[PDB]
Amino acid sequence: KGEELFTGVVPILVELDGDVNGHKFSVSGEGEGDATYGKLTLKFICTTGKLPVPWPTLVTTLVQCFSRYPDHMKRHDFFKSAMPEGYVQERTIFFKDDGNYKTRAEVKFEGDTLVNRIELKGIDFKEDGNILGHKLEYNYNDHQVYIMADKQKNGIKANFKIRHNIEDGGVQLADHYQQNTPIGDGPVLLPDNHYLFTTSTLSKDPNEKRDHMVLLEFVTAAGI
Length: 224
Hints:
There is one protein chain. It contains one helix and eleven strands, in the order E-E-E-H-E-E-E-E-E-E-E-E. By secondary structure, the chain is mainly beta. It has a single domain (4-222), classed as Green fluorescent protein (Green Fluorescent Protein, Beta Barrel). It has an eleven-stranded mixed barrel. 37% of the residues are buried. Keywords: Chromophore, Luminescence, Photoprotein. One of its GO terms (biological process) is generation of precursor metabolites and energy. Energy-transfer acceptor. Its role is to transduce the blue chemiluminescence of the protein aequorin into green fluorescent light by energy transfer. Fluoresces in vivo upon receiving energy from the Ca(2+)-activated photoprotein aequorin.
């Protein structure tokens, strides 16, 4: 199975090609994931200068195959069983009273590395809004992802809202819609509707001078 591929620690590579209101940028991240515990540790760097959007707005874009599925749903794991060929992840993220992100990612194995490679296009943003004006605090409000099977496209989908805290004020909404389809031709486990639960912690590397995000995550899956 692609499940046997996650029994130990797996190195993770993340590459992102971004373009928001014509402001172009690149992000690289790397670290590792342990699906036995559902733990992820990654460090991201904006490889092109200052990031033109706040780091928290990118978190959901920057590998749900690392979630710990307990043994009573080891069959409900679309993400793991799609490997090594992998899966496509697509989202549109609407920032309320502001622009939106469109993302297309391919998540697959390359050698023994789990690679998440992303293109992101952001359109119609306010240049002094909460996003391009860098007005969001550096923290994270996790939300549970209710993952629904989609027998039509042989994949999964989900829809959820993330809350971003606004410096000097209230909360900025990020309305997420997601669909994943497998890249291979082989059969794939179309799960029953279950939950992913995440806790993200964001921090900084004191010896890192480039614009960057250190990210630690714990995630696993639940039924009902």
